């Protein structure tokens, strides 16, 4: 199972790790992708997870979008986890760089409550433009299921742990 995580709360754990390497090692039941409404996995966590699946995640995602249309900001869908996990929960956090409502971050984290345990990144962090300290606070105050957060950036991981209230 998950190793080397720092316990933040009853159900939230955090580690300085590459979520792709973490997924290949643990092969969790659920890996969360930092998705956009189009499931276009170009960069950030989505681009990295997709590249690890040899683009199978993108092929599956394009078929999902062709059938269902785009997701809502704050919404999610469950697709295959390919070689990374049993399932991938594609969650759309607000992209503040695209001028999206930061209040939608709590709705985005609520999707995690449908899964008993997840390997996840901080939603709306990185290229999505939100403050990762705020994302961690929303995560701990919203998610009730067991969430193992992988933070790629060491300096950000240290800042998150050292400033955690
Ligand atoms: N080897 C994947 C590294 N990584 C982790 C998180 C987000 C983007 C990214 O490229």
Swiss-Prot record:
Localization (cell): Host endoplasmic reticulum membrane
Swiss-Prot/TrEMBL catalytic activity: Thiol-dependent hydrolysis of ester, thioester, amide, peptide and isopeptide bonds formed by the C-terminal Gly of ubiquitin (a 76-residue protein attached to proteins as an intracellular targeting signal)
Domain Macro: 1-165
Stated regulation of activity: Inhibited in vitro by GRL-0617.
Membrane topology of the entry: Multi-pass membrane protein
Result after altering residue 162 to L: In strain: Gamma/P.1
Known function: Responsible for the cleavages located at the N-terminus of the replicase polyprotein. Participates together with nsp4 in the assembly of virally-induced cytoplasmic double-membrane vesicles necessary for viral replication. Antagonizes innate immune induction of type I interferon by blocking the phosphorylation, dimerization and subsequent nuclear translocation of host IRF3. Also prevents host NF-kappa-B signaling. In addition, PL-PRO possesses a deubiquitinating/deISGylating activity and processes both 'Lys-48'- and 'Lys-63'-linked polyubiquitin chains from cellular substrates.
Subunit structure: May form homohexamers. Interacts with N protein.
Identification of the protein by name: Papain-like protease nsp3
Residues of the full protein shown: 1027 to 1191 of 7096
């Amino acid at each position: 199972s998950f190793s080397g995580y720092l316990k933040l709360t009853d159900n939230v754990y955090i580690k300085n790790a590459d979520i792709v390497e973490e997924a290949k090692k643990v092969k969790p039941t659920v890996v969360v992708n930092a998705a956009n409404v189009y499931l276009k996995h170009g960069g950030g966590v989505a681009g990295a997870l997709n590249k690890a699946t040899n683009n199978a995640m993108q092929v599956e995602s394009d078929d999902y979008i062709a059938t269902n249309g785009p997701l809502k900001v704050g919404g999610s869908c469950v697709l295959s986890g390919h070689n990374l996990a049993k399932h991938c929960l594609h969650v759309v956090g607000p992209n503040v760089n695209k001028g999206e409502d930061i209040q939608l971050l709590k709705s985005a984290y609520e999707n995690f409550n449908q899964h008993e345990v997840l390997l996840a990144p901080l939603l709306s962090a990185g290229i999505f433009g939100a403050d990762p300290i705020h994302s961690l606070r929303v995560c701990v105050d919203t998610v009730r299921t067991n969430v193992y957060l992988a933070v790629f950036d060491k300096n950000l991981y240290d800042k998150l742990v050292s400033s955690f209230l």
